[PDB]
Structures are given as C-alpha cells and as structure tokens.
Design an enzyme around this catalytic site. Sequence first.
Site, PDB file in Angstrom:
ATOM      1  N   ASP A 118       0.837  -1.184   0.000  1.00  0.00           N
ATOM      2  CA  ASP A 118       0.000   0.000   0.000  1.00  0.00           C
ATOM      3  C   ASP A 118       0.885   1.250   0.000  1.00  0.00           C
ATOM      4  N   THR A 156      -7.068   3.287  -2.083  1.00  0.00           N
ATOM      5  CA  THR A 156      -6.632   1.940  -1.797  1.00  0.00           C
ATOM      6  C   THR A 156      -7.622   0.873  -2.297  1.00  0.00           C
ATOM      7  N   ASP A 258       2.464   3.008   3.194  1.00  0.00           N
ATOM      8  CA  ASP A 258       1.345   3.970   3.195  1.00  0.00           C
ATOM      9  C   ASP A 258       1.049   4.543   4.583  1.00  0.00           C
ATOM     10  N   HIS A 262       1.343   8.679   5.091  1.00  0.00           N
ATOM     11  CA  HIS A 262       0.344   9.646   5.540  1.00  0.00           C
ATOM     12  C   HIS A 262       0.866  10.520   6.692  1.00  0.00           C
ATOM     13  N   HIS A 306      -0.917   2.480  -5.347  1.00  0.00           N
ATOM     14  CA  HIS A 306      -0.896   3.936  -5.638  1.00  0.00           C
ATOM     15  C   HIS A 306       0.352   4.477  -4.984  1.00  0.00           C
ATOM     16  N   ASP A 684     -20.816   6.344 -21.039  1.00  0.00           N
ATOM     17  CA  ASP A 684     -20.376   4.998 -20.652  1.00  0.00           C
ATOM     18  C   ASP A 684     -19.041   4.597 -21.270  1.00  0.00           C
ATOM     19  N   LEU A 686     -18.402   4.098 -24.343  1.00  0.00           N
ATOM     20  CA  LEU A 686     -18.619   3.270 -25.516  1.00  0.00           C
ATOM     21  C   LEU A 686     -19.439   4.020 -26.564  1.00  0.00           C
ATOM     22  N   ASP A 688     -22.060   5.527 -28.976  1.00  0.00           N
ATOM     23  CA  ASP A 688     -23.529   5.582 -28.908  1.00  0.00           C
ATOM     24  C   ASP A 688     -24.149   5.076 -30.211  1.00  0.00           C
TER      25      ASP A 688
HETATM   26  C1  LIG Z   1     -15.057  -2.313 -19.004  1.00  0.00           C
HETATM   27  O1  LIG Z   1     -15.416  -3.683 -18.953  1.00  0.00           O
HETATM   28  C2  LIG Z   1     -16.687  -3.997 -18.463  1.00  0.00           C
HETATM   29  C3  LIG Z   1     -16.835  -5.533 -18.369  1.00  0.00           C
HETATM   30  O2  LIG Z   1     -16.766  -6.118 -19.657  1.00  0.00           O
HETATM   31  C4  LIG Z   1     -17.740  -3.355 -19.364  1.00  0.00           C
HETATM   32  O3  LIG Z   1     -18.940  -3.425 -18.632  1.00  0.00           O
HETATM   33  C5  LIG Z   1     -19.903  -4.291 -19.251  1.00  0.00           C
HETATM   34  O4  LIG Z   1     -20.567  -3.629 -20.297  1.00  0.00           O
HETATM   35  C6  LIG Z   1     -21.698  -4.246 -20.894  1.00  0.00           C
HETATM   36  C7  LIG Z   1     -22.349  -3.212 -21.825  1.00  0.00           C
HETATM   37  O5  LIG Z   1     -22.672  -2.007 -21.124  1.00  0.00           O
HETATM   38  C8  LIG Z   1     -22.719  -4.727 -19.853  1.00  0.00           C
HETATM   39  O6  LIG Z   1     -23.643  -5.579 -20.501  1.00  0.00           O
HETATM   40  C9  LIG Z   1     -25.009  -5.342 -20.082  1.00  0.00           C
HETATM   41  O7  LIG Z   1     -25.324  -6.185 -18.986  1.00  0.00           O
HETATM   42  C10 LIG Z   1     -26.654  -6.139 -18.517  1.00  0.00           C
HETATM   43  C11 LIG Z   1     -26.760  -7.069 -17.314  1.00  0.00           C
HETATM   44  O8  LIG Z   1     -25.800  -6.667 -16.366  1.00  0.00           O
HETATM   45  C12 LIG Z   1     -25.679  -7.630 -15.293  1.00  0.00           C
HETATM   46  O9  LIG Z   1     -24.976  -8.841 -15.613  1.00  0.00           O
HETATM   47  C13 LIG Z   1     -23.542  -8.805 -15.702  1.00  0.00           C
HETATM   48  C14 LIG Z   1     -22.984 -10.203 -16.016  1.00  0.00           C
HETATM   49  O10 LIG Z   1     -22.839 -11.036 -14.875  1.00  0.00           O
HETATM   50  C15 LIG Z   1     -22.915  -8.139 -14.463  1.00  0.00           C
HETATM   51  O11 LIG Z   1     -21.523  -7.971 -14.614  1.00  0.00           O
HETATM   52  C16 LIG Z   1     -23.560  -6.766 -14.225  1.00  0.00           C
HETATM   53  O12 LIG Z   1     -22.945  -6.115 -13.122  1.00  0.00           O
HETATM   54  C17 LIG Z   1     -23.201  -4.692 -13.111  1.00  0.00           C
HETATM   55  O13 LIG Z   1     -24.356  -4.279 -12.377  1.00  0.00           O
HETATM   56  C18 LIG Z   1     -24.357  -4.419 -10.949  1.00  0.00           C
HETATM   57  C19 LIG Z   1     -25.326  -3.387 -10.371  1.00  0.00           C
HETATM   58  O14 LIG Z   1     -26.624  -3.638 -10.860  1.00  0.00           O
HETATM   59  C20 LIG Z   1     -22.989  -4.265 -10.235  1.00  0.00           C
HETATM   60  O15 LIG Z   1     -22.879  -5.242  -9.214  1.00  0.00           O
HETATM   61  C21 LIG Z   1     -21.719  -4.294 -11.120  1.00  0.00           C
HETATM   62  O16 LIG Z   1     -20.756  -3.411 -10.563  1.00  0.00           O
HETATM   63  C22 LIG Z   1     -21.989  -3.925 -12.587  1.00  0.00           C
HETATM   64  O17 LIG Z   1     -22.314  -2.549 -12.620  1.00  0.00           O
HETATM   65  C23 LIG Z   1     -21.891  -1.865 -13.810  1.00  0.00           C
HETATM   66  O18 LIG Z   1     -22.690  -2.199 -14.955  1.00  0.00           O
HETATM   67  C24 LIG Z   1     -23.989  -1.617 -15.091  1.00  0.00           C
HETATM   68  C25 LIG Z   1     -24.614  -2.031 -16.429  1.00  0.00           C
HETATM   69  O19 LIG Z   1     -24.498  -3.424 -16.626  1.00  0.00           O
HETATM   70  C26 LIG Z   1     -23.903  -0.090 -14.950  1.00  0.00           C
HETATM   71  O20 LIG Z   1     -25.191   0.479 -15.063  1.00  0.00           O
HETATM   72  C27 LIG Z   1     -23.225   0.291 -13.620  1.00  0.00           C
HETATM   73  O21 LIG Z   1     -23.024   1.678 -13.484  1.00  0.00           O
HETATM   74  C28 LIG Z   1     -21.856  -0.369 -13.452  1.00  0.00           C
HETATM   75  O22 LIG Z   1     -20.890   0.348 -14.194  1.00  0.00           O
HETATM   76  C29 LIG Z   1     -25.081  -6.928 -14.068  1.00  0.00           C
HETATM   77  O23 LIG Z   1     -25.369  -7.668 -12.901  1.00  0.00           O
HETATM   78  C30 LIG Z   1     -27.586  -6.570 -19.644  1.00  0.00           C
HETATM   79  O24 LIG Z   1     -28.902  -6.624 -19.134  1.00  0.00           O
HETATM   80  C31 LIG Z   1     -27.446  -5.616 -20.845  1.00  0.00           C
HETATM   81  O25 LIG Z   1     -28.334  -5.981 -21.914  1.00  0.00           O
HETATM   82  C32 LIG Z   1     -29.098  -4.878 -22.511  1.00  0.00           C
HETATM   83  O26 LIG Z   1     -28.579  -4.516 -23.790  1.00  0.00           O
HETATM   84  C33 LIG Z   1     -28.611  -5.606 -24.722  1.00  0.00           C
HETATM   85  C34 LIG Z   1     -27.822  -5.272 -25.992  1.00  0.00           C
HETATM   86  O27 LIG Z   1     -27.100  -6.432 -26.347  1.00  0.00           O
HETATM   87  C35 LIG Z   1     -30.048  -6.060 -25.060  1.00  0.00           C
HETATM   88  O28 LIG Z   1     -30.069  -7.432 -25.421  1.00  0.00           O
HETATM   89  C36 LIG Z   1     -31.105  -5.801 -23.966  1.00  0.00           C
HETATM   90  O29 LIG Z   1     -32.139  -5.020 -24.573  1.00  0.00           O
HETATM   91  C37 LIG Z   1     -30.630  -5.152 -22.633  1.00  0.00           C
HETATM   92  O30 LIG Z   1     -31.377  -3.948 -22.440  1.00  0.00           O
HETATM   93  C38 LIG Z   1     -32.506  -4.111 -21.531  1.00  0.00           C
HETATM   94  O31 LIG Z   1     -32.231  -3.605 -20.226  1.00  0.00           O
HETATM   95  C39 LIG Z   1     -31.994  -2.198 -20.227  1.00  0.00           C
HETATM   96  C40 LIG Z   1     -31.333  -1.754 -18.913  1.00  0.00           C
HETATM   97  O32 LIG Z   1     -32.264  -1.761 -17.851  1.00  0.00           O
HETATM   98  C41 LIG Z   1     -33.306  -1.480 -20.601  1.00  0.00           C
HETATM   99  O33 LIG Z   1     -33.171  -0.073 -20.583  1.00  0.00           O
HETATM  100  C42 LIG Z   1     -33.753  -1.934 -22.002  1.00  0.00           C
HETATM  101  O34 LIG Z   1     -34.954  -1.268 -22.399  1.00  0.00           O
HETATM  102  C43 LIG Z   1     -33.813  -3.478 -22.067  1.00  0.00           C
HETATM  103  O35 LIG Z   1     -34.921  -3.977 -21.325  1.00  0.00           O
HETATM  104  C44 LIG Z   1     -25.957  -5.563 -21.277  1.00  0.00           C
HETATM  105  O36 LIG Z   1     -25.543  -6.726 -21.979  1.00  0.00           O
HETATM  106  C45 LIG Z   1     -22.036  -5.453 -18.697  1.00  0.00           C
HETATM  107  O37 LIG Z   1     -22.951  -5.727 -17.650  1.00  0.00           O
HETATM  108  C46 LIG Z   1     -20.877  -4.631 -18.139  1.00  0.00           C
HETATM  109  N1  LIG Z   1     -20.172  -5.393 -17.121  1.00  0.00           N
HETATM  110  C47 LIG Z   1     -19.640  -4.869 -16.018  1.00  0.00           C
HETATM  111  C48 LIG Z   1     -18.965  -5.859 -15.110  1.00  0.00           C
HETATM  112  O38 LIG Z   1     -19.683  -3.667 -15.723  1.00  0.00           O
HETATM  113  C49 LIG Z   1     -17.403  -1.891 -19.664  1.00  0.00           C
HETATM  114  O39 LIG Z   1     -18.275  -1.419 -20.672  1.00  0.00           O
HETATM  115  C50 LIG Z   1     -15.937  -1.686 -20.064  1.00  0.00           C
HETATM  116  N2  LIG Z   1     -15.651  -0.277 -20.163  1.00  0.00           N
HETATM  117  C51 LIG Z   1     -15.143   0.335 -21.244  1.00  0.00           C
HETATM  118  C52 LIG Z   1     -14.958   1.840 -21.117  1.00  0.00           C
HETATM  119  O40 LIG Z   1     -14.816  -0.249 -22.292  1.00  0.00           O
HETATM  120 CA   LIG Z   2     -22.115   5.654 -24.975  1.00  0.00          CA
HETATM  121 ZN   LIG Z   3      -3.321   5.637   2.224  1.00  0.00          ZN
END
Ligand SMILES: *[C@@H]1O[C@H](CO)[C@@H](O[C@@H]2O[C@H](CO)[C@@H](O[C@@H]3O[C@H](CO[C@H]4O[C@H](CO)[C@@H](O)[C@H](O[C@H]5O[C@H](CO)[C@@H](O)[C@H](O)[C@@H]5O[C@H]5O[C@H](CO)[C@@H](O)[C@H](O)[C@@H]5O)[C@@H]4O)[C@@H](O)[C@H](O[C@H]4O[C@H](CO)[C@@H](O)[C@H](O)[C@@H]4O[C@H]4O[C@H](CO)[C@@H](O)[C@H](O)[C@@H]4O)[C@@H]3O)[C@H](O)[C@H]2NC(C)=O)[C@H](O)[C@H]1NC(C)=O
Ligand SMILES: [Ca+2]
Ligand SMILES: [Zn+2]
Length: 802
Positions: A118, A156, A258, A262, A306, A684, A686, A688
Amino acid sequence: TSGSCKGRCFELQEVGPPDCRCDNLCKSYSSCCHDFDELCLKTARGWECTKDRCGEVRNEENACHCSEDCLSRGDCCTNYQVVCKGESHWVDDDCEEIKVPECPAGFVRPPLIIFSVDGFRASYMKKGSKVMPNIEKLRSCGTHAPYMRPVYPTKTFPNLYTLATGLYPESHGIVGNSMYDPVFDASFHLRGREKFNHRWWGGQPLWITATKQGVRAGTFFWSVSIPHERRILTILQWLSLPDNERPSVYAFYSEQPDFSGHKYGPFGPEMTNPLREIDKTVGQLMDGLKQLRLHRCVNVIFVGDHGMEDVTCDRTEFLSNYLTNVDDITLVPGTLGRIRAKSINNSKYDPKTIIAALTCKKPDQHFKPYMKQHLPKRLHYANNRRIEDIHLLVDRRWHVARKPLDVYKKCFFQGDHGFDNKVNSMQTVFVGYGPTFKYRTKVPPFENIELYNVMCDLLGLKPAPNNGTHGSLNHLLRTNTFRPTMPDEVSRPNYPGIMYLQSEFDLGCTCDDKVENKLEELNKRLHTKGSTKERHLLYGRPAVLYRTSYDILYHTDFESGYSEIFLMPLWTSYTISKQAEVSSIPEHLTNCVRPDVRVSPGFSQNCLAYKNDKQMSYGFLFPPYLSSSPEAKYDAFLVTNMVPMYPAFKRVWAYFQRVLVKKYASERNGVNVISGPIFDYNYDGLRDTEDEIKQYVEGSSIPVPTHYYSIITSCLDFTQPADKCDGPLSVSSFILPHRPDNDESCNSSEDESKWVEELMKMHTARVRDIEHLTGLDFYRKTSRSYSEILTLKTYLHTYESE
Ligand SMILES: *[C@@H]1O[C@H](CO)[C@@H](O[C@@H]2O[C@H](CO)[C@@H](O[C@@H]3O[C@H](CO[C@H]4O[C@H](CO)[C@@H](O)[C@H](O[C@H]5O[C@H](CO)[C@@H](O)[C@H](O)[C@@H]5O[C@H]5O[C@H](CO)[C@@H](O)[C@H](O)[C@@H]5O)[C@@H]4O)[C@@H](O)[C@H](O[C@H]4O[C@H](CO)[C@@H](O)[C@H](O)[C@@H]4O[C@H]4O[C@H](CO)[C@@H](O)[C@H](O)[C@@H]4O)[C@@H]3O)[C@H](O)[C@H]2NC(C)=O)[C@H](O)[C@H]1NC(C)=O
Ligand SMILES: [Ca+2]
Ligand SMILES: [Zn+2]
Ligand SMILES: CC(C)(C)C(=O)Nc1cc(C#N)ccc1COC(=O)N1C[C@@H]2CN(C(=O)c3ccc4[nH]nnc4c3)C[C@H]2C1
Ligand SMILES: CC(C)(C)C(=O)Nc1cc(C#N)ccc1COC(=O)N1C[C@@H]2CN(C(=O)c3ccc4[nH]nnc4c3)C[C@H]2C1
Ligand SMILES: [K+]
Ligand code: NA
C-alpha cells in the site's frame, strides 16, 4: 462460539454458522473461537531461529520452529536453513535465469504470489534502493516497469479491486474510499461493517475466477492485527498442504509504507524504516520458498496500489470560501471532491450555480469543478450511480474540505493520495519474478487494469470480460497462454464515384469557386481514386466493428470514412510531413461549403441548419489551413468534411489545426493524423447508437458530437519521416470535449497560445479509449507484431516530468 480452532488455524474451506471461525475475517465478524489467538496467533520466541535452537525438541507454543521435523511439518521459521543448515539467504545468491519451472512433484502449475504494498510510490525503487536489497534483486533479475499507472481515484480499495478484476472503478463499483449509493440509501466507509456487504462489489475478482475454474485461492484479506511474519508463515504453511488442498494463487498485503507516508510525507526521514521492514518481509518469503524448494517454481508479483504525495492541512481549500449556500451540500472531501444535495426532497438545489460559483473564482484556486461527464475521458470516472454529478479535481499537494471546522473538528498528516492518475507522485510499482516472467527485462510503464489478464494467463484461467487489452502485456512473459487476433471488420465500406450533379443539391450552401489542362485533370482523377492513399493512410483503413453504412472518400490531401447514418466522417486520415507549409483560408472562401458529387443530397449535411441554429457553427476535420495547393484546398470545403462545432470549441480546434499540427510535424518529423467525432451521451465510454443521441443541429438529423478525437502517429526513430518509417511507431492522442463554452480553461479569454495546448494535454487519451468510443479498430496494416500494436494502443502520453 464455544468450539475450538485446534488443528484448523487459517483453514481455507469454510464452516456453517452460528459455528466458530478461525480465518482472517473472524475478528471482523466477532466469530473467532475462544482459543483463536492462543492456537492460531502464537508469538513465543519471535520469528527467527538462533543457533542454540537448532535441532531442538518441538515446543508447540513457539511462533515458529527450529526443530528437526519442521521442514516436513511445513512450519520452520523462514531463516531455519540459514542458521541451522548453513544455507545462504535468498538475497545473497546470484541471480540465475529461470528457464523452466523447477517445482516439487505434485505441482500441476507454478504458484502465483501477489505481494501487494500500500502506498509504494514508483520512485522508491531508485530512491530507497540502498535499503531494499531483496526487492532490488526481484526488480533487477525479474521483469520490471519504471512505474505502473493506478486508476482514478488513486485510493486503496478502488485500486486493489481494480488489480483483482481488471475493471475501472466505475464498472466494479468501488468508486471511492467512501461512497453513498442513492439506491441503497447507504454509505460505505473505511470504518464499519457496511463495506462487507457483497452488494457493493461488482465484477469478477481473481479469487472467484480461480475457484469457478477449479483453481484454489489463499486469502485476499488479512487482519490488521495479524503481524506480517505470521502472514508469511501462513502462506508458507498453505504451500505445504497436500496437492488436492493446496492453493495455486496467494495474496500478501502490506499497510506500509502507506501508513507512515500519511504521517510523514512520501520522503520523510521516518520512511526509511517502513521500507527496510517491507524488504525484510520479502526476504522472509523468498527464504521460505527456497526452503520449500519453490523459489524457482513460484511466480511472484510485487505490486503497489498507488503512490503518495506531500499534503498538509494548511493546503486545504474550503468550499465555504466559495459558496454561501454551503449547508445545502454534502461533500465527499479530500484529494478529490464529490458534491451532492444534502437532501433530495429539496427542489431548490441547482448544480449549475454550484458549478458556476466554483469556477475560476480565485486567481490561484487549487481545484476545478466538473460535471462528471466532462471529466477527461481517460479517467473513466462517470458511469456509476455512486459517482456524484459534481466532481472536483484537486491539484496535487492539496485537499478540498467543506468548512474550516471539518479540518480542525476532525495538523495530523503530511502525506496523502487520491489525485488524478497521471500525477507522478501517484505512480506505483510493478515487478514480476519467476519461471513465467522474463529474465532481467525492463518493460514500458503500463496501467494496472492490464494485470488481471496476465494473472489469469499465469494461472491458466480464462479471464472474465474486463478493461485490459489482452495481449498488450505479452511482452512481460516468457511463455504466453494468450495469442491475440485482430477483430473482424463488421461493415465493409462503399467506394462511391461521381453520381450527382450540383443542381440536385439544395443545401443552402454557397461557394465562390467557378474559375476558368488535360494532364491536370487525369492527375486529379487519380486522386479521387486513391493515388496518394498510401501517403495519407499509413496503417491501413480503420475497421468498423459494428453494422452501419459508410463510404470511403479519397482526396489529394486526405482520406475519410464517411458515415451515411451520422452524416459526417467516422474518421479522416492525413499526413503532414515536416516540410509541409501552412496557408490561410482566402477571403472569398470563408463561408465556402461545397456539395460532394459522390454522396446523395439525402446523406449530406446542409448549411441552412447551421444558419437557423444560433448555438451551433461548424468546422472541418481535414483543416483547410493545411491543403497542399490552392486547387486541393477546394477538397477541404466539401460538405462531407464538415462537422458541428460550437463557436467556443472552434477556438480550441482552430488552434490545434492551424498551429499545433505543424508544430508536431516539425518536432516529430512528419505526423499522420486521424481525427473524428465521438458520441457518448450516456457517458459509458462506448460508442452511442443513433437512438442515444440527445442533441442535433436545430431542425435537422445532424447529430452533435460530445467529443472530437485525434490520433497523431509518427516514427519512434524520428530520423525517419512519418511516411517512410521502418520500425516501431510513436503515438499521442486526445479526446477533446465538445463544449459550448471554455469555462474549463480559466485563462481562455487570453490568446489560444496561452491555454489551448494545456487543455489538450489534460484530455490526452489512449488509442484504445478512442476505439471503445468509436467502434473503430486502428493500425490494421503495419509491419509491426500485433502484440506490439496492442501495447501502442494502450500507451498514454501523460505530459508529466520524469
Ligand atoms: C469495461 O469492462 C466492463 C466488463 O466487460 C464493461 O462493462 C460491461 O458492459 C456491458 C455493456 O454495457 C454490460 O452488458 C449489459 O449487462 C446487462 C446485465 O448486467 C448484469 O450482468 C452482468 C454479467 O454477470 C454483471 O456484470 C452486471 O454487473 C453490473 O451491475 C451491478 C449493479 O446492478 C454491479 O454489481 C456491477 O458493478 C456492474 O455494474 C456496472 O454495470 C452496469 C450495467 O451493466 C452499470 O449500469 C453500472 O453503473 C456499473 O458500471 C449486471 O449484474 C444486460 O442486461 C445488458 O443488456 C441490454 O442490452 C442488450 C444489448 O445487447 C439487449 O439485449 C437488452 O435489450 C438489454 O437492455 C434491456 O435492459 C436495459 C437496462 O435496464 C433497458 O433499458 C432496455 O430497455 C432493455 O430492457 C448488457 O448486456 C455489462 O454488464 C458490463 N459489465 C460490467 C462488469 O460492468 C465496460 O463497458 C468496459 N468499459 C469500457 C470503457 O470499455
Ligand atoms: Ca455511450
Ligand atoms: Zn493511504
Ligand atoms: C477487496 C480487497 C480485499 C481489498 C482486495 O482486492 N484485496 C487485494 C487484492 C489483490 C489483488 N489482485 C491483492 C491483495 C489484496 C489485499 O487486501 C487486504 O488484505 N486488505 C487491503 C485493505 C486496505 N485496508 C484499509 O483499510 C485502508 C483503507 C484506506 C486507506 N488509505 N490509505 N491506506 C489505506 C488502507 C484494509 C486492508 C485489507
Ligand atoms: C474474502 C474477501 C471477499 C476477499 C473479502 O474479505 N473482501 C472484502 C474485504 C474488505 C476489507 N477490508 C471489505 C469488503 C470485502 C468484500 O466483502 C464481500 O464481498 N464478502 C465478504 C463476506 C465474507 N463472507 C462470509 O460468509 C464469511 C467468510 C469468512 C468468515 N469468517 N468469520 N465470519 C465469516 C463470514 C461472505 C463474503 C462476501
Ligand atoms: K449558427
Ligand atoms: Na474560460
């Protein structure tokens, strides 16, 4: 809690409650058996063998043993062999290349030990080198980077969990050292038990990836009370378990340097000791491994979360000095600021005025306010409900606090961390040592998001989807599990010819261009057909990785991929050699916009829309300023080269195109530039889809970019020009936010030479960030290996000192 820990100290496989525990988490749950400390946390006789203890009779009460049965019981003190057997300490041994894993029978794969420290600032490797001989041996004999970039915020938990998952905090959910979740109505603090609720922790961390695939893990949590010596002995005991029980992946954690940092600052005189101590622990582990015949079998990663910076109480900025309504906000304070409404039942809370009140209000102010979507895209710090709309980026060496009472009703400290992750003081360390890492090899600095992939490679696991670019660190490794391949192009381009007559267009556009040779027209014919395409497109056309409709357009000076869906290029590519000269837009061509006879009125922009829209003007992706001749300049005014731009942003863009490109071409010996629009309305990170665009040039289907990018490439060997480069490439890129004002730059009412470049530096970016944001894939045709191209795509030009 009436049961016993007898023979189950630090047992890996868990038990069913209310039934007492003997693992690292038990103190935190108040679930330890009554004999936990007595049996599991022995301290008798300390941590080292002394000569008199050699061959002794086993006394089960000692912390460790020098008895004869100790090697086979798996519980000698780490220096047993040195004292009792005349072995040498690991550090005193010469370093010898580890060509192949030298493992005891029964070892299905080399173990991985993650040694996390750390606050271990990057520059301690050189500066504390005299007192860290074990760490310096790891570093010079294994694989090391000059520094490793943490993630923002450089706290951390966000960083250790990024290491474990390969995810940005915005994706794993640990977006700070304290968090309020608006949907849980709950706070997460360093103090307390809320943080132990699984609901905060997203993604899939290494220990879970390992289990799900039949690979066992030692603990990734250690109790603060458990001394480091007992931590090493526990890892050493587990490594002595039976083949079917023994974990393959291990973690160690140090609170130092760490903890001291501090108190005393990063380079306080009181820092030498913590560094000696950490080194001694590494010495213990390596001596331990060597006893077990594992020192040429285990892969060891020495990694920090860090760095640490000089920060003191008198260098705090108080929000009460800026706002009068200071009681209507909740601030998450410190080395970053996050502001939300003190109560949501209040519809008198206006973020715009808060921002306004925090903007350029003091000549020297030491933070800057941002709506989260406006933060530099390289920080990836926006896409989470836990991140407040209002963010303050605080200057290195400073703090933000709400009122003066908060710093004197709560000076203690001389060091802190959490600033912007490009800050030199925040950089941390990476060393890999073992059979799978390279021998005596320096690698370039890289980001901690890349490591999860490598640790999965190291363990033969298939990584869960994450934010690393798998293959970008293949050059760390002697043997690679992963062979990356270029993704397939999804949409192939159209190559339109001349298909439309001027009079078919009715775009409200005007150009002064009707002026009165046969060879001259075949020359220009070859241009519209890709004659200089090898000059202006140096690395092959980018590949579109999604389904869409787009046209390749050739010109004398530049080449573009024009989207019929977004009515503007996805990308425009051009090369400016060192010799190339700058010119101005002649007076008669100031308002000049020409229809493109290769592209239908229906897939074109129109000038009328820009007239009617009082907010929005327009600029050009290939700059008119840089045309090779007066005739070629007409190409630059095609309606297919045009993009929507706020007048405020045109100031930035014009300076970059008129002055900065030519400067870079001179310093770098030519540059190749690929510029284009980015649309990220849902912030996000990614690309749009159409249906996500929140803003159009008034009364048209012309979508407005949230950002503009450029990727500026040249030859690493700058004695070769950009267009005739035989070896490694050099790149820098940016993603500028397309904003209707220049509030972000406090000195923007001055000449562009005073601020624009400073803004562009702030918004520096990796090529890989632009790929996510555009759905394009660059560098498709080069002479370079794909692994080297991945490294290049993850490169970030940081604009920091050395
Ligand atoms: C960095 O890498 C990461 C990992 O690869 C990238 O993040 C991924 O991006 C994907 C695209 O955005 C995303 O895929 C979506 O997943 C939806 C289901 O999500 C759940 O399942 C996964 C798998 O186990 C799980 O990992 C998720 O965990 C998230 O959510 C919980 C909180 O609820 C947290 O515990 C966790 O931290 C994580 O949160 C993050 O993700 C969510 C979004 O998923 C953010 O909102 C948070 O802020 C946070 O950052 C979930 O448990 C799935 O349902 C999606 O499918 C929709 O789109 C498809 C298109 O193919 C379509 O078939 C459907 O229509 C569907 O849309 C429907 O639902 C909509 C939403 O309510 C609704 O509006 C519509 O009308 C539809 O009904 C989609 O496939 C994936 O989950 C995340 N994974 C992670 C781990 O974050 C990230 O993008 C990368 N970053 C960069 C900059 O490149
Ligand atoms: Ca976007
Ligand atoms: Zn510290
Ligand atoms: C979720 C978790 C357990 C933190 C994790 O990912 N850990 C992980 C992943 C990998 C990897 N890959 C390798 C080693 C590990 C090792 O984790 C642990 O034993 N711990 C680290 C926590 C840090 N901590 C603090 O309270 C703290 C808080 C705020 C601070 N500011 N400045 N210093 C601070 C220290 C308690 C220590 C428990
Ligand atoms: C083990 C792990 C997941 C690495 C961890 O400790 N992570 C970590 C470190 C810190 C800190 N500091 C803060 C939060 C976290 C994240 O918490 C979680 O997601 N979880 C930890 C809970 C532990 N648990 C149990 O049933 C359990 C296990 C062993 C026990 N002994 N005595 N009582 C026990 C109860 C369910 C796990 C879910
Ligand atoms: K306008
Ligand atoms: Na300004």
